[PDB]
Design an enzyme around this catalytic site. Structure first.
Site, PDB file in Angstrom:
ATOM      1  N   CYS A  52       0.901  -1.161   0.000  1.00  0.00           N
ATOM      2  CA  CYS A  52       0.000   0.000   0.000  1.00  0.00           C
ATOM      3  C   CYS A  52       0.940   1.212   0.000  1.00  0.00           C
ATOM      4  O   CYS A  52       1.918   1.222  -0.766  1.00  0.00           O
ATOM      5  CB  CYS A  52      -0.998  -0.065   1.143  1.00  0.00           C
ATOM      6  SG  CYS A  52      -0.255  -0.594   2.709  1.00  0.00           S
ATOM      7  N   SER A  53       0.700   2.223   0.817  1.00  0.00           N
ATOM      8  CA  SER A  53       1.637   3.344   0.879  1.00  0.00           C
ATOM      9  C   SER A  53       2.839   2.940   1.769  1.00  0.00           C
ATOM     10  O   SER A  53       3.984   2.961   1.321  1.00  0.00           O
ATOM     11  CB  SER A  53       0.932   4.593   1.415  1.00  0.00           C
ATOM     12  OG  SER A  53       1.699   5.752   1.153  1.00  0.00           O
ATOM     13  N   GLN A  83      -3.561  -1.286  10.805  1.00  0.00           N
ATOM     14  CA  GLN A  83      -3.239   0.041  11.319  1.00  0.00           C
ATOM     15  C   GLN A  83      -4.360   0.651  12.155  1.00  0.00           C
ATOM     16  O   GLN A  83      -4.103   1.587  12.893  1.00  0.00           O
ATOM     17  CB  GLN A  83      -2.896   0.984  10.163  1.00  0.00           C
ATOM     18  CG  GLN A  83      -1.462   0.894   9.707  1.00  0.00           C
ATOM     19  CD  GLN A  83      -0.510   1.421  10.751  1.00  0.00           C
ATOM     20  OE1 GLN A  83      -0.312   2.626  10.872  1.00  0.00           O
ATOM     21  NE2 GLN A  83       0.109   0.520  11.482  1.00  0.00           N
ATOM     22  N   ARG A  86      -3.272  -1.708   4.929  1.00  0.00           N
ATOM     23  CA  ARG A  86      -4.100  -2.396   3.936  1.00  0.00           C
ATOM     24  C   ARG A  86      -3.463  -3.715   3.460  1.00  0.00           C
ATOM     25  O   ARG A  86      -4.147  -4.710   3.225  1.00  0.00           O
ATOM     26  CB  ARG A  86      -4.352  -1.434   2.765  1.00  0.00           C
ATOM     27  CG  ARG A  86      -5.240  -0.251   3.188  1.00  0.00           C
ATOM     28  CD  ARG A  86      -5.497   0.795   2.134  1.00  0.00           C
ATOM     29  NE  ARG A  86      -4.332   1.655   2.016  1.00  0.00           N
ATOM     30  CZ  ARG A  86      -4.244   2.696   1.206  1.00  0.00           C
ATOM     31  NH1 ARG A  86      -5.282   3.002   0.424  1.00  0.00           N
ATOM     32  NH2 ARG A  86      -3.101   3.418   1.170  1.00  0.00           N
ATOM     33  N   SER A  87      -2.156  -3.698   3.263  1.00  0.00           N
ATOM     34  CA  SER A  87      -1.393  -4.913   3.011  1.00  0.00           C
ATOM     35  C   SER A  87      -1.523  -5.941   4.157  1.00  0.00           C
ATOM     36  O   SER A  87      -1.593  -7.136   3.910  1.00  0.00           O
ATOM     37  CB  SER A  87       0.077  -4.562   2.810  1.00  0.00           C
ATOM     38  OG  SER A  87       0.266  -3.755   1.647  1.00  0.00           O
TER      39      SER A  87
END
Ligand SMILES: NCc1ccc(NC(=O)C(=O)O)cc1
Ligand SMILES: [Mg+2]
EC number: 3.1.3.48
Length: 297
Positions: free
Chosen positions: A214-215, A261, A220-221
């Site tokens: 992701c970022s 997160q 999200r990963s």
């Protein structure tokens, strides 16, 4: 089990505290090489680093650092490489990792721009005509095709080692509708996406580990891998009850920090796994329901 646990946490409203225990119990390992001066411009976020013990080493003299971690899930027999979104200076390293690690698939869970800022470099070619060359790593990358759906896009790329003139097909699975620090629209679109990745052979042990990003390569990963691993374990012993999500997550967090997160990302993980269990346990129809409910076309 997890479904009963899910309700117990819900009806008491205690996800923040469950998520915080996870945060409190999570492993702490050193990130010495990530923090070396010579690597500052190789890291997107100051507070997101790969542990030394699980970091992926680039095969080169000079500097073998990339902000990427091997998450090796022993019981499940699945490995993932989780990495930050490539920086303008690490797109070459990124594609180098993919070559050396013999990866077949890359799962991207973010957009290049989110919330008015740039979360990831544009590290793949957007047009067949305009291939990219990474001079530093002597790799060539060409767009072969894409298939744009409503909330995700799948691309075929050809990666060439310009040194050996050897080429590989890489599949890029790009989820375009998942907000940073957010959750997917519903379990259905997420699951429809996960099973698209699986159906491709990208997660199969005959290939190198999937690259997931992701970022930062954690929120999200983390959500993606967790659900995937959990459904895999459930599949392997055909026992929804044997799987403890929190424990799988803590196991993953030995290999990279920060996975999942937010509390809502945790809640969503539960949600996705419980819904995915249906298919695992023999209800073939739910996959077609996910495709419909996802509103793919
Ligand atoms: N606060 C540092 C920080 C910055 C970005 C993230 N994003 C993600 O994990 C993500 O892309 O989902 C996570 C942590
Ligand atoms: Mg064109």
């Amino acid at each position: 089990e997890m479904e009963k646990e899910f309700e117990q946490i819900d009806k008491s409203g205690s996800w923040a505290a469950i998520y915080q225990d996870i945060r409190h119990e999570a492993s702490d390992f050193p990130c010495r090489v990530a923090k070396l001066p010579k690597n500052k411009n190789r890291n997107r976020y100051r507070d997101v680093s790969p542990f030394d013990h699980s970091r992926i080493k680039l095969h080169q003299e000079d500097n073998d650092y990339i902000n990427a971690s091997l998450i090796k899930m022993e019981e499940a027999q699945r490995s993932y490489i989780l990495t930050q979104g490539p920086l303008p200076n690490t797109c070459g390293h990124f594609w180098e990792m993919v070559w050396e690690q013999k990866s077949r698939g890359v799962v991207m869970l973010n957009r290049v721009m989110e919330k008015g800022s740039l979360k990831c470099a544009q590290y793949w070619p957007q047009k067949e005509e305009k291939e990219m060359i990474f001079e530093d790593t002597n790799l060539k990358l060409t767009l072969i095709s894409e298939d744009i759906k409503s909330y995700y896009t799948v691309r075929q790329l050809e990666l060439e080692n310009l040194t050996t003139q050897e080429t590989r097909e890489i599949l890029h699975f790009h989820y375009t509708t998942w907000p940073d620090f957010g959750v997917p629209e519903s379990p259905a679109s997420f699951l429809n996406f996960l099973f698209k990745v699986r159906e491709s052979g990208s997660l199969s042990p005959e290939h190198g580990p999937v690259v997931v990003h992701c970022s930062a390569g954690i929120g999200r990963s983390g959500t993606f891998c967790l659900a995937d691993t959990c459904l895999l374990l459930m599949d392997k012993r055909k026992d929804p009850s044997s799987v403890d999500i929190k424990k799988v997550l803590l196991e993953m967090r030995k290999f990279r920090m920060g996975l999942i997160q937010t509390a809502d990302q945790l809640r969503f993980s539960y949600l996705a796994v419980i819904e995915g269990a249906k298919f695992i346990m023999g209800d073939s129809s739910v996959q077609d329901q996910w495709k419909e409910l996802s509103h793919e076309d």
